[PDB]
Design a binder for these strands. Structure first.
Ligand SMILES: [Zn+2]
Ligand SMILES: [Zn+2]
Lengths: 853, 73, 186, 186
RNA sequence: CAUGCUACGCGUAG
RNA sequence: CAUGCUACGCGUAG
RNA sequence: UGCUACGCGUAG
RNA sequence: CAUGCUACGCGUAG
């Protein structure tokens, strides 16, 4: 029957499901040459390739192989599969333990593989190792494709094997046995000294014991890396090796210094789970004065706060707790939403909210209790240490960087920095003394340049404050925003603002950040996505727990892609230290929730300068990963087009048989994707126009492929109920940015207009977030903006959708009448009253969508 | 319909409860928030009316806080 | 705009120009009347812009003070207004249980805790007078929130046990009203 | 505007024009003095414009120096506040154990997370439910981080004192969970 | 009068 | 000296 | 009481 | 606040 096979020859190359005298003599000779090795092979029904295929190409419909694997090795019982959402990670996390039952079975295999390699190294046999040729027990029964050479000089090709096995190591937690004394599940844990933070020798030992024959140089500390391609390679192994070490060793490295005679406690390094130990280079002891820059550096540093605070043990959450900066725990609650009775009565008088009507209120202000805010932080357990396919990742990072070749980036001075709003919070402990304007006016441009130069050589740990957002939603769950300190913003901006403004000012690209939907912009984007597609079909999906469950490797990759624009302004060490700062201030940071410090396991903070753009790069990377996984999962012998066959062959070559970047094939793959896979990505929202035939024959990415990639990378389960697929371009996308698309006729031209959900607009109009917004006579502009946003509803075939705009117009007119009456009662009528007329005419709202301006 | 104005009445009820310094009590405030969120995210008028009765009884529990006789008339 | 001193001059210049062009004068007359009306219009637009800026400043000040007054008036009268709106919408809802509990809180029958929706739970409520008692209570059946409850236990003010048989019009003066009655939902 | 040099020439030209118009001279001298007066008025307008401009930039510089003084004042205030807070948190930490753990380290650098684990005398534990209370903070004294902590105070979610006897299985629903227990090291 | 800026406010989006 | 056209500068209004 | 984008409004 | 346009007045040169 169908069995997993990783085949590679001149005809077919790929890892997919296949059906299944002199060569036999060669096999017997190779076996006789490798008979003494215990790792050489009974045989099991399933091999390693089958497990890798089941865990990386997971489908809710076909789980027979994975179920049989879990039941055969006593991982779980059959009735466990009767539980609903047993495969999901968000729902029923107990499956994380089930897969752990395979970890040892995987770990025990790795050693055998090494032994097998040793055997070849003892016989001088050059060959390639494949997953389909090693059973799940660990024995190797393959004795083909092995050429004889001088005994003692043979080299193995272990790229594809370990590469494809990387995700299974972190998914099954195979290295857990390394956390025990003498490596034994029955023996107790290893008691490491709390004063020990350098595990470099341990990482070298683990690498020499597990990945011994990996010919690429591995650096435990990312400070000694050649380029970003080496930083990512080192982080891929550091993520796996950090699981064994205790979590108390990681974090900022503190030390005692002397300032004018008094002992201070300052951070002089950082232990990243992915970058290793990073020591600051500008540490000056026995200082006699402290300036504004150093004052900010020490205030943002959590060393003093953690040393002054008392110990904390929080049982509500599973994340690590640092200390409690206050003697009393603070509980933050959300206030109930306000209700505008005037607009509600005006709408009810016009026949709205009647029984059986398709238009009803679905969005309100949801309140929360005191233990809800921290409960949101309790979601951060969805972030698990995930190891990614390193070669596939090094290819996808390049393919994604090719999407950002049209923009320009670099470092700008403080005089060129633009801040949207200055009267906003500056984080902890900077919010206790003033807003961001305070520190932006106190520090001159020279001080900001000095701080930037200091961050270019040293890393500063920061504290980010997570607070609840008071906004409209349709779910009872609350939303939290993590405001970072100003020391992080003034650096992230200075570093990435040129690229951020170049991306926002570019039109007609994949990333549609900065493109307005008014004045015919939506039509422009829609026609840009339809750029020459043979059989166009639209698709869209979502990312469950994106900001929470996204691994750290992809965030580091996105940061590297964003920093690759500094080829002439920043050096190697400067870029590495900027990446370390970004990881210490966004990736692995210190969260001050309820007056208590906690260690964030990972994920993307939502208060960073590179927030939307990081998510956009992540989306492009996931899309390219799905494309590569879909194209390489095909048989390759049933395709009638030679071009795609040779392209898949070269893809496999550049992935698992090549190490250097092949720019020619990168160009070819980028052109292929732009031709058969047009993308419109805005942060986490994505709309793809793909050739339907190529998706049917498995030449491009599909829904199941995105689901599998999210399963084995993002460690989340993407249900098909939330993903939409459209077969007719005339109707347009189903939903993009909470906006639906409709093809209308404007000036003898057929153009696409975006209309929102009437329920959201009516909820915004009826329920406000403050008391003055209810009946403060300032709501005129609010309702004008709501009508501007909801105008395209007047062309909907449903009359209930079109009546909302007329209701808003009449309400604006009534509000103007009441305002005029009140002004006449208090004093006299205004002279410029006629100017208000345009606000109750439909022409002012119709001109907002004309492509003239 | 009764669902819409029942949801609005529950919203105003929770607003008045929060204004009456009920949030000082963790258990009572959490129960009121749960009831209000269940009223908002509901599709049956009967359960919504029962939860509205519960929240109105919560409001009526405090006698000295609100003057029913003078305010209702 | 007739109140401005330059309005008379502008009107006179315009009338003179019209009468001169209607009479067919020489070209020098056309030039001098053009100059006159041009300087008159310059002065007129000067004064008009000045007056319009004055009135615009006044209008902005008036709308700003009106905004501030409305803001402070809404900040001041929030509690009473919100509670009146709440009770108005409550009366507009017109439900049996709602109106029943409103009347029971009006006459004096207010509960001690939340009216439970579970099939089996304890509901405790005070009764001040025997009139409301006989109106709401009937033996071991309690009509509350348009629902029937099985009367369980009764306590007086001094926390002494009293049976249902002792509650009567003859023994009401001997009772320490109000009475806290706890019951179970049927 | 008397301080302008061209203002005196313009005034003299206007006086000469008035004197000549009061005498009724020939048209030639009248138009000549008109042209001269117009030149003088143009120069007067130019010098008045540059005077308004220099006054405007003077006001702008005054506002700029006022803003700079405000910035310096706020910077001094922020520096004072930051230094005060830093010195307070410096005197707040415990040195007896910090110096010990620093001199015990050979490299001199230690992780941050171990600082409050081994050098803090007070421990605040937040317990959500009674099961976790019995599993962790059982009795008057408990063990955590290889240290014996004696319970000093227990507070509810409403910032109220809760006795040790009040924490029971039958009284768990009436308690305001979670409970924050502060215990000093012993 | 047009355009673009600056200041303040408001609305939507991720 | 008067009338007209062109280039330049200043002020005013839109 | 976060980051970014767009869009209105009122002043310079 | 700046730039440009339109209209008006003034002055210089052809
Ligand atoms: Zn490296
Ligand atoms: Zn640079």
């Amino acid at each position: 029957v169908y069995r997993a096979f990783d085949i590679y020859n001149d005809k077919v190359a790929g890892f997919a499901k296949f059906l299944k005298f002199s060569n036999y003599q060669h096999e017997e000779t190779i076996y006789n040459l490798l008979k003494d090795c215990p790792a050489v092979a009974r045989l099991t029904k399933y091999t390693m390739a089958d497990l890798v295929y089941a865990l990386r190409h997971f489908d809710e419909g076909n789980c027979d192989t994975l179920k049989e694997i879990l039941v055969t090795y006593n991982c779980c019982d059959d009735d466990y599969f009767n539980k609903k959402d047993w495969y999901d990670f968000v729902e029923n996390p107990d499956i994380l333990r089930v897969y752990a039952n395979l970890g040892e079975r995987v770990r025990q295999a790795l050693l055998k593989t090494v032994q097998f390699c040793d055997a070849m190294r003892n016989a001088g046999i050059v060959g390639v190792l494949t997953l389909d040729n090693q059973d799940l027990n660990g024995n190797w029964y393959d004795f083909g494709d092995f050429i004889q050479t001088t005994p003692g000089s043979g080299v193995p090709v272990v790229d594809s094997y370990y590469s494809l096995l990387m995700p299974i190591l972190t998914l099954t937690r195979a290295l857990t046995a390394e956390s025990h004394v003498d490596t034994d599940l029955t023996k107790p844990y290893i008691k490491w000294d709390l004063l020990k933070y350098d595990f470099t020798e341990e990482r070298l030992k683990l690498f020499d014991r597990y990945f011994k024959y990996w010919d690429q140089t591995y650096h435990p500390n990312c400070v000694n890396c050649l380029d970003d391609r080496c930083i990512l390679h080192c982080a891929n192994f550091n993520v796996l090796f950090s699981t064994v070490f205790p979590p108390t060793s990681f974090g900022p490295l503190v030390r005692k210094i002397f300032v004018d005679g008094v002992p201070f406690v300052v951070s002089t390094g950082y232990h990243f789970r992915e970058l290793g130990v990073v020591h600051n280079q500008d540490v000056n002891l026995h200082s006699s004065r402290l300036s504004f820059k150093e004052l900010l550096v020490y205030a943002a540093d959590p060393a003093m706060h953690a040393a002054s605070g008392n110990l904390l043990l929080d049982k509500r959450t599973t994340c690590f707790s640092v200390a409690a900066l206050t003697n009393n725990v603070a509980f933050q609650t959300v206030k109930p939403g306000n209700f505008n009775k005037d607009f509600y009565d005006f709408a009810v008088s016009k026949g709205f909210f009647k029984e059986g009507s398709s238009v009803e209120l679905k969005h309100f202000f949801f309140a929360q209790d005191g233990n809800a805010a921290i409960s949101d932080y309790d979601y951060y357990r969805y972030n698990l240490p995930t190891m990614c396919d390193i070669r596939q990742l090094l290819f996808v990072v390049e393919v994604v960087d090719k999407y950002f070749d049209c923009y320009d980036g670099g470092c700008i001075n403080a005089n060129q920095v633009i801040v949207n709003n200055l009267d906003k919070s500056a984080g902890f402990p900077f919010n206790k003394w003033g807003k961001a304007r305070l520190y932006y006016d106190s520090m001159s441009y020279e001080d900001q340049d000095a701080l930037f130069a200091y961050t270019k050589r040293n890393v500063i740990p920061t504290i980010t404050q997570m607070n609840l957002k008071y906004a409209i939603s349709a779910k009872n769950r609350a939303r939290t925003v993590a405001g970072v300190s100003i020391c992080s913003t003034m650096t992230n901006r200075q570093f990435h603002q040129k690229l951020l403004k170049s991306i926002a000012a570019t039109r007609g690209a994949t990333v549609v950040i900065g493109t307005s939907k008014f004045y015919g912009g939506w039509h422009n984007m829609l026609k840009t996505v339809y750029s020459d597609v043979e059989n166009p079909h639209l698709m869209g999906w979502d990312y469950p727990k994106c900001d929470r469950a996204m691994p750290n490797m992809l965030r580091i990759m996105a940061s590297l892609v964003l920093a690759r624009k500094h080829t002439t302004c920043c050096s190697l060490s400067h870029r590495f230290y900027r990446l370390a700062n970004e990881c210490a201030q966004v990736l692995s940071e210190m969260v001050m929730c309820g007056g208590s410090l906690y260690v964030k396991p990972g994920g993307t903070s939502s208060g960073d300068a590179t927030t939307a753009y990081a998510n956009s790069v992540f989306n492009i990377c996931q899309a390219v990963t799905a494309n590569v996984n879909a194209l390489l999962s095909t048989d390759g012998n049933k395709i009638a087009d030679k071009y795609v066959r040779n392209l898949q062959h070269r893809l496999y070559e550049c992935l698992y048989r090549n190490r250097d970047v092949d720019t020619d094939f990168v160009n070819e793959f980028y052109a292929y994707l732009r031709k058969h896979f047009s993308m419109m990505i805005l942060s986490d929202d994505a709309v793809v126009c793909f050739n339907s035939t190529y998706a049917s024959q498995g030449l491009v990415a599909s829904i199941k492929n995105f689901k599998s990639v999210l399963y084995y990378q993002n460690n989340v389960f993407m249900s098909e109920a939330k993903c939409w697929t459209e077969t007719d371009l005339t109707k347009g996308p189903h939903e993009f940015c909470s906006q639906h698309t409709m093809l209308v006729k404007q000036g003898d031209d057929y153009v696409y207009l975006p209309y929102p959900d009437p329920s959201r607009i009516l909820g915004a109009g009826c329920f406000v977030d403050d008391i003055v917004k209810t009946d403060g006579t300032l709501m005129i502009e609010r309702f004008v903006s709501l009508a501007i946003d909801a105008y395209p509803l007047t062309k909907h075939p449903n009359q209930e959708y079109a009546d909302v705009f007329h209701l808003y117009l009449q309400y604006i007119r009534k509000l103007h009448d009441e305002l005029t009456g009140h002004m006449l009662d208090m004093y006299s009528v205004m002279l410029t009253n006629d100017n208000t007329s345009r606000y109750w005419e439909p022409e002012f709202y119709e001109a907002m969508y004309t492509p003239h301006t | 319909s009764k669902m819409s104005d029942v949801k609005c009445t529950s919203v105003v009820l929770l607003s008045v409860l929060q204004q009456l310094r009920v949030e000082s009590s963790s258990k009572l405030w959490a129960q009121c928030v749960q009831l209000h969120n269940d009223i908002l995210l509901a599709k049956d008028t009967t359960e919504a009316f029962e939860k509205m009765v519960s929240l109105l009884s919560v409001l009526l529990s405090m006698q000295g806080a609100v003057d029913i006789n003078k305010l209702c008339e | 705009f007739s109140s401005l001193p330059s309005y008379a001059a502008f009107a006179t210049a315009q009338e003179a120009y019209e009468q001169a062009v209607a009479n067919g004068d020489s070209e020098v007359v056309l030039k001098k009347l053009k100059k006159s009306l041009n300087v008159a219009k310059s002065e007129f637009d000067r004064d008009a812009a000045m007056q319009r800026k004055l009135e615009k400043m006044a209008d902005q000040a008036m709308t700003q003070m009106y905004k501030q007054a409305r803001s402070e008036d809404k900040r001041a009268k929030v509690t009473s207004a919100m509670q009146t709106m709440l009770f108005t919408m409550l009366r507009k809802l017109d439900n049996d249980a709602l109106n029943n509990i409103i009347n029971n809180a009006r006459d004096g029958c207010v509960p001690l805790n939340i009216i439970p929706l579970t099939t089996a739970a304890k509901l405790m409520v005070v009764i001040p007078d025997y009139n409301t008692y006989k109106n709401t209570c009937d033996g071991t059946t309690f009509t509350y929130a348009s629902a029937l409850w099985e009367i369980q236990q009764v306590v007086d003010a001094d926390s002494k046990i009293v049976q249902l048989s002792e509650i009567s019009m003859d023994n009401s003066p001997n009772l320490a009203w109000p009475l806290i009655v706890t019951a179970l939902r049927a």
